[PDB]
Design a protein around this ligand. Structure first.
Ligand SMILES: N[C@@H](Cc1ccc(O)cc1)C(=O)O
Ligand SMILES: N[C@@H](Cc1ccc(O)cc1)C(=O)O
Lengths: 329, 329
């Protein structure tokens, strides 16, 4: 234990889509899966990052070799969502905050590798492959592949066309079997699947999370307790509505995977607390309106504040706030 | 001697257009001009290469520091007009044949520097500047800048969009004051003028040759004498027509600069030989039809065979024909 079947279940649970199941099962019969997730080092990560972090936790539980790519060059190429001056600073802020998140979840930062894009994306071998890729990829396909991912501006920049090619080559240079990201990466993933073989590199397994509504949409990982409180009961959460509910989604994609259960906090009057061992049970009760929006929010607020506390405390040290300020001036 | 005025005259004579006269004259008051010419290492050079080589001869006579760029990566990016396997071979063939041309003209290969693009275009600093350029250049402008230069195909490749940016950066990395090329480079030259300052680099002086009709259009630098003969009296050369005349153009752009004069070979019957000290005099006589097409061709044929002889002999050595064959299979 875990068997290949248990590993496959941990790796794929809560995803919207799995591309490459045949190869995924072939690998898992024999060895650990090598997988990575990338994030461009752009705006301050917020509590919604707990969603991909929960999948990273799952990968690590399944025994996967996991790489996290801090894609600083990608931040630069995507309409300068980060300038060159600030890239090193934002890489450090991202690395710190992602490590704190994973620590807070209780994930062995063990088979976990952190790498930043400019560690290898400016090397001669990689650059040579960027030019080879450029010689088989049409402008049309590269503009198409990036449409849901890079900022769409009225006069498209060349950098925006380069972005998906580099993301494709990243699969080969990080030497992984698989890449995980949101469903909005799908066109880049199929682009990699199409073009890496023209360079003599193999296609990868691709794992995609659904688009998950936010808790608000704005809660920062360093927001203090009363700001978390303040922001939560302005959140959208209609009685009985189990669609497009950011509070239910957060529970489904983060709190259940984290603990295998979820506790609703309710007054004695309305039945007292209840412990759910599966999301579908909680969903049924919410649909029936015997879990009120206010109690759902209070239950999430307690759980979430538990997740943020060690992060807030770790960034409470001198120099981490100078880092926070300097990263985002 | 040469004075700045004589240097300016040598450098700019026979050009179609000079961009940047103000800076050119500022430089020449003080020091030697640093200038380069690039050629993608694509198809076999033919006798038409004598036209840019004549300007290189002029630059060297004026005391310029001249670089010749063998743009092998550019050959690759331009719709794979050369594959990666053959690039080293075609670089060697080009270097050999260009050096033989210049030797045949009688040009001191002295302040002459040969460099190949992949010597520096895959370095970290250059690649970083390719990404910065990509972040300010629109796809629109880079497609526009390359329209007369890179192969135009029905599904434009990304590499074609990269091509002019690299040509612009080449001005900075070769540390020149100026670039010389044909008038068909003009949109790339103005592109460099527009964008190098966004990277903190200065605009360059740009020197442009006219588009010159070919002697045939096909005479190879290694063609033997009877093939040269054969190909010449199939050439287009109408009595009295001094426009679009490839034979007159070759004389104007290559043989006059080379020797300061040109000798028409004519029978006693029609006046015997005549020596022209300026092109306009020869042009007037051709217009008046007292220099016949056949005699003009014979005079060019003699001069040209004199230019090719040491080239043919130098490539007559073992290994230069294996080079020729292996470069072009
Ligand atoms: N495109 C990803 C970031 C990314 C960058 C480079 C990669 O190799 C992988 C992922 C995003 O939008 O979040
Ligand atoms: N564009 C030039 C070749 C060239 C390539 C790179 C340069 O830096 C300069 C010139 C041609 O068409 O012949």
């Amino acid at each position: 234990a875990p068997s290949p079947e248990e590993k496959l279940h941990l790796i794929t649970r809560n995803l919207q889509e799995v591309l490459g199941e045949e190869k995924l099962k072939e690998i898992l019969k024999e060895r650990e899966l090598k997988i990575y997730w990338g994030t461009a080092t752009t705006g301050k990560p917020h509590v919604a990052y707990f969603v991909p972090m929960s999948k990273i936790a799952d990968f690590l539980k399944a025994g996967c070799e996991v790489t996290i790519l801090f894609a600083d060059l990608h931040a630069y190429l995507d309409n300068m969502k980060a300038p060159w001056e600030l890239l090193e600073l934002r890489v450090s802020y991202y690395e710190n905050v992602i490590k704190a998140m994973l620590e807070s979840i209780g994930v062995p930062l063990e088979k976990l590798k952190f790498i930043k894009g400019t560690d290898y994306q400016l090397s001669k071998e990689y650059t040579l492959d960027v030019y080879r890729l450029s010689s088989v990829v049409t402008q049309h396909d590269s503009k198409k592949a990036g449409a849901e991912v890079v900022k769409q501006v009225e006069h498209p920049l060349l950098s925006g066309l380069l972005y998906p090619g580099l993301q494709a080559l990243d699969e080969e240079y990080l030497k992984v079997d698989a890449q995980f990201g949101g469903i909005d990466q799908r066109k880049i993933f199929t682009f990699a699947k199409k073009y890496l073989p023209a360079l003599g590199y193999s296609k990868r397994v691709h794992l995609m999370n659904p688009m998950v509504p936010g808790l608000t949409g704005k809660i920062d990982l360093l927001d203090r307790k009363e700001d978390v409180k303040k922001k939560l009961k302005k959140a959208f959460c209609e009685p009985g509505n189990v669609e497009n509910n950011g509070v239910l989604s957060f529970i489904k994609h983060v709190l259940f995977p984290l603990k295998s259960e979820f506790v609703i906090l309710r007054d004695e009057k309305w039945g007292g607390n209840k412990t759910y061992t599966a999301y579908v049970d909680l969903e049924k009760d919410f649909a029936a309106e015997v879990v009120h929006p206010g109690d759902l929010k209070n239950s999430v607020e307690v759980a979430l504040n538990k997740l943020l506390d060690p992060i807030r405390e770790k960034f409470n040290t001198p120099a981490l706030k100078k880092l926070a300020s300097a990263a985002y001036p």
